[PDB]
PDB file of C-alpha atoms in Angstrom:
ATOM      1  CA  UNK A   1     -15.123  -4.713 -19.215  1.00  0.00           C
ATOM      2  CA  UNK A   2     -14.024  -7.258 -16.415  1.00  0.00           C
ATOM      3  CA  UNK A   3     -11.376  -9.353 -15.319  1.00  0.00           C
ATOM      4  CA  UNK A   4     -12.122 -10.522 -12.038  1.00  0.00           C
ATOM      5  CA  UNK A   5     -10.335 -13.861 -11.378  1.00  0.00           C
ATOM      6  CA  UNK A   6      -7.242 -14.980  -9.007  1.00  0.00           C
ATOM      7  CA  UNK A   7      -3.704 -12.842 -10.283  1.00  0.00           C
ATOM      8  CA  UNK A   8      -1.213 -14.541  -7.508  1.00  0.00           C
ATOM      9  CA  UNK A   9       1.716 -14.683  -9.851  1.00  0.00           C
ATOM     10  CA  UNK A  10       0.747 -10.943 -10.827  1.00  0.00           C
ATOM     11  CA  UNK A  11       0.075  -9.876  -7.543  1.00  0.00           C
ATOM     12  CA  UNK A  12       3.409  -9.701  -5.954  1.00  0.00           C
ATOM     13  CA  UNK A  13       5.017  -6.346  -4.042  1.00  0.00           C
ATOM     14  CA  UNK A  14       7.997  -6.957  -6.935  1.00  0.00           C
ATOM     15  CA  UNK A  15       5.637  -6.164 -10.260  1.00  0.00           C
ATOM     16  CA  UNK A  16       3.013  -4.362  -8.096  1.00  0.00           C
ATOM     17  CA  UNK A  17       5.262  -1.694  -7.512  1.00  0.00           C
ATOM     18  CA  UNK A  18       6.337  -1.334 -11.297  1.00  0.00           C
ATOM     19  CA  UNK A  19       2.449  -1.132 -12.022  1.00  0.00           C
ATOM     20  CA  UNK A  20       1.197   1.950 -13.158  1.00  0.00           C
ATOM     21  CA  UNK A  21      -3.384   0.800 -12.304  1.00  0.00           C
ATOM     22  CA  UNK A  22      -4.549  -2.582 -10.706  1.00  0.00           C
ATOM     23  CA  UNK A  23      -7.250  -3.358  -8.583  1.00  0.00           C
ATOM     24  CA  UNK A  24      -7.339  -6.876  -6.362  1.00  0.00           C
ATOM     25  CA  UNK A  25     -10.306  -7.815  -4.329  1.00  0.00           C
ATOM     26  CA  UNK A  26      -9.736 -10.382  -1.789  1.00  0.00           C
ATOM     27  CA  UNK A  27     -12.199 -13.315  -0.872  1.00  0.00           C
ATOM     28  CA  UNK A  28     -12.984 -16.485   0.815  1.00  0.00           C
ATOM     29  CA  UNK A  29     -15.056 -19.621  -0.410  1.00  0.00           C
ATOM     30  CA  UNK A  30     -17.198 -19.505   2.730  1.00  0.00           C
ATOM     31  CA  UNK A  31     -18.173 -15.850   2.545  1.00  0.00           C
ATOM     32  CA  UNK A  32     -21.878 -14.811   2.233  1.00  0.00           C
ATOM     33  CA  UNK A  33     -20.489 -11.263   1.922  1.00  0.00           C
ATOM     34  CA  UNK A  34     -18.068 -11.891  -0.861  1.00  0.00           C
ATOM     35  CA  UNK A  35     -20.664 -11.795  -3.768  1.00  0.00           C
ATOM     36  CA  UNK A  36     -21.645  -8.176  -3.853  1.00  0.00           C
ATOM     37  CA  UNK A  37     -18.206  -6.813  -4.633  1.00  0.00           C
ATOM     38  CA  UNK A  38     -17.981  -9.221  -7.434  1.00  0.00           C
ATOM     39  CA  UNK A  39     -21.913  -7.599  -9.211  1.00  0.00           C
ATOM     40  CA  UNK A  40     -20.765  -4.169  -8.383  1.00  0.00           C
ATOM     41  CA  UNK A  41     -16.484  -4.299  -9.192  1.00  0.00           C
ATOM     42  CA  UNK A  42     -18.512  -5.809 -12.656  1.00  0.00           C
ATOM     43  CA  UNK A  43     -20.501  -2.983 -12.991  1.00  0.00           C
ATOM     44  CA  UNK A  44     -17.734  -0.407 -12.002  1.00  0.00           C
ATOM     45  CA  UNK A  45     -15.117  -2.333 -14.520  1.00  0.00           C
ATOM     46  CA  UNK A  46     -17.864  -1.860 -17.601  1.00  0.00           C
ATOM     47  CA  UNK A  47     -17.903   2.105 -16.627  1.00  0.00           C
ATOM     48  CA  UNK A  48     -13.953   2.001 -15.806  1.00  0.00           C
ATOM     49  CA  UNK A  49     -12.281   0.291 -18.982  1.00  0.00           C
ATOM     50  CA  UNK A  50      -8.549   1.442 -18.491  1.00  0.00           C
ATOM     51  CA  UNK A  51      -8.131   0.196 -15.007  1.00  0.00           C
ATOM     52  CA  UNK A  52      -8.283  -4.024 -14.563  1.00  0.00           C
ATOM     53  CA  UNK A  53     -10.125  -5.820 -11.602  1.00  0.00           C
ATOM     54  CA  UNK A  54      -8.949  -9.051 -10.654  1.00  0.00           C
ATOM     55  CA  UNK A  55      -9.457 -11.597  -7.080  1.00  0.00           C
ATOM     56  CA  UNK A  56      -7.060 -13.034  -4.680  1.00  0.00           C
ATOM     57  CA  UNK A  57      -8.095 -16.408  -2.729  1.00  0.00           C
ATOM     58  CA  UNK A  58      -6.677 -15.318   0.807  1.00  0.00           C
ATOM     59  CA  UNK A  59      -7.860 -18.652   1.697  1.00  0.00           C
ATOM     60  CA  UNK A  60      -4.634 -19.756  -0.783  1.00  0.00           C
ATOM     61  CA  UNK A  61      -2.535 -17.072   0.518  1.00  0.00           C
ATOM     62  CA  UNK A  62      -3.180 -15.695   3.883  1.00  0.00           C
ATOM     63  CA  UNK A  63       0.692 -14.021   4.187  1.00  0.00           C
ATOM     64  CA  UNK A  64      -0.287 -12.233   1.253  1.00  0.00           C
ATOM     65  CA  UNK A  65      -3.345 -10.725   2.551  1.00  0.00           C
ATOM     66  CA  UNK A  66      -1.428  -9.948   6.036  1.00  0.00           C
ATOM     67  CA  UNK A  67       1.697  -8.367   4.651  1.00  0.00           C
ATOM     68  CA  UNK A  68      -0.613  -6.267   2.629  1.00  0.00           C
ATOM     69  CA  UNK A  69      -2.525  -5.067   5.748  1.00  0.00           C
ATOM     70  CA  UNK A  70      -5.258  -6.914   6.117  1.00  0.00           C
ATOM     71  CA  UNK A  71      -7.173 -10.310   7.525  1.00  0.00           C
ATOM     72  CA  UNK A  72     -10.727  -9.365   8.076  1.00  0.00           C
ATOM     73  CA  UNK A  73     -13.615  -9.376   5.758  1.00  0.00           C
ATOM     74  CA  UNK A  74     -13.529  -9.145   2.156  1.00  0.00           C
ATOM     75  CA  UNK A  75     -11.287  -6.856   1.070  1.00  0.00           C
ATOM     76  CA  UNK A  76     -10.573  -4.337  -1.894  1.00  0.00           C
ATOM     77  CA  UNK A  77      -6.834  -3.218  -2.732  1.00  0.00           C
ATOM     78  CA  UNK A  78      -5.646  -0.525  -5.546  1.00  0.00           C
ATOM     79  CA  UNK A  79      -2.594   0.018  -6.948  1.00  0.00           C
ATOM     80  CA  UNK A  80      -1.626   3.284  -8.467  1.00  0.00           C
ATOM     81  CA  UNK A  81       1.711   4.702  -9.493  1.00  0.00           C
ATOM     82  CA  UNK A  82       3.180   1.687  -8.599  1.00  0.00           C
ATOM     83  CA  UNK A  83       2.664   1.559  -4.819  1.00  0.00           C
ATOM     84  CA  UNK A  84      -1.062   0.862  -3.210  1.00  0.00           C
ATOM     85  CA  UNK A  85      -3.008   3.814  -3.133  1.00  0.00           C
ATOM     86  CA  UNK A  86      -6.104   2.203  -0.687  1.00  0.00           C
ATOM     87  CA  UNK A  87      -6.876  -1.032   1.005  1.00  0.00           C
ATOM     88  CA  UNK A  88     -10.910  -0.746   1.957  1.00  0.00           C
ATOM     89  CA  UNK A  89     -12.407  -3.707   4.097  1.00  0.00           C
ATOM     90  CA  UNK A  90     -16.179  -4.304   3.685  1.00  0.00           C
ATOM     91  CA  UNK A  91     -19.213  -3.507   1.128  1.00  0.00           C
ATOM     92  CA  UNK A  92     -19.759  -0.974  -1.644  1.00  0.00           C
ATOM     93  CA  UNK A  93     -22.062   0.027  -4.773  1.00  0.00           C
ATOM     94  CA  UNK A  94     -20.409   0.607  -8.394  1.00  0.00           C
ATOM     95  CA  UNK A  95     -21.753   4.513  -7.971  1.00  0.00           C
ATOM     96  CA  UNK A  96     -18.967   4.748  -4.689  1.00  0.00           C
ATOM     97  CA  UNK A  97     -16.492   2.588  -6.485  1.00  0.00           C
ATOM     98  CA  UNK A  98     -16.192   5.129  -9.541  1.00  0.00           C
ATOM     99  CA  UNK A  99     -16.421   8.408  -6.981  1.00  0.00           C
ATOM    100  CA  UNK A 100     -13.510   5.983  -4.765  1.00  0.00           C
ATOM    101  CA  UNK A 101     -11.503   5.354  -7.822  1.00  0.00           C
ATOM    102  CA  UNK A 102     -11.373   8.781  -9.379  1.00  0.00           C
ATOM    103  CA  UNK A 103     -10.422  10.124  -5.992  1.00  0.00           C
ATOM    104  CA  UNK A 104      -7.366   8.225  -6.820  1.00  0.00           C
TER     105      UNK A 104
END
């Protein structure tokens, strides 16, 4: 029902676009912020079993974050059909997550 933990060495353009679902939120150590996503991507995961939610530390691997769009707030990424299908900076509840994801 959740996976959420650093995926670096799965995370990669070169398997990520051989995927078919992933979902990678992206976070900092010194982020007040950061938390929510983390009790409602937990909440979304338990009414989402098929699709896996993982972190990245951007801290660990800010070309990462860049190349993939982004260097701002925390951050969530999804991967579908093997390419990403949205990159959303900021806060959300597991109720918009699920309405988010099945719009993808």
């Amino acid at each position: 029902m959740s996976a959420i933990r650093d995926i670096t060495t799965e995370a990669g353009m070169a398997h990520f676009e051989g995927l078919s679902d992933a979902i990678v939120f992206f976070h900092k150590n010194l982020c007040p912020h950061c938390k929510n996503m983390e009790k409602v991507l937990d909440k979304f995961g338990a009414r989402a079993p098929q699709v896996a939610i993982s972190s990245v530390d951007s801290e660990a691997r800010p070309e990462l974050m860049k190349e993939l769009g982004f260097e701002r707030v925390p951050t969530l990424v999804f991967i579908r059909d093997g390419k990403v299908a949205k990159v959303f900076s900021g806060i959300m509840n597991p109720r918009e997550l699920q309405a988010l994801y099945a719009s993808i």
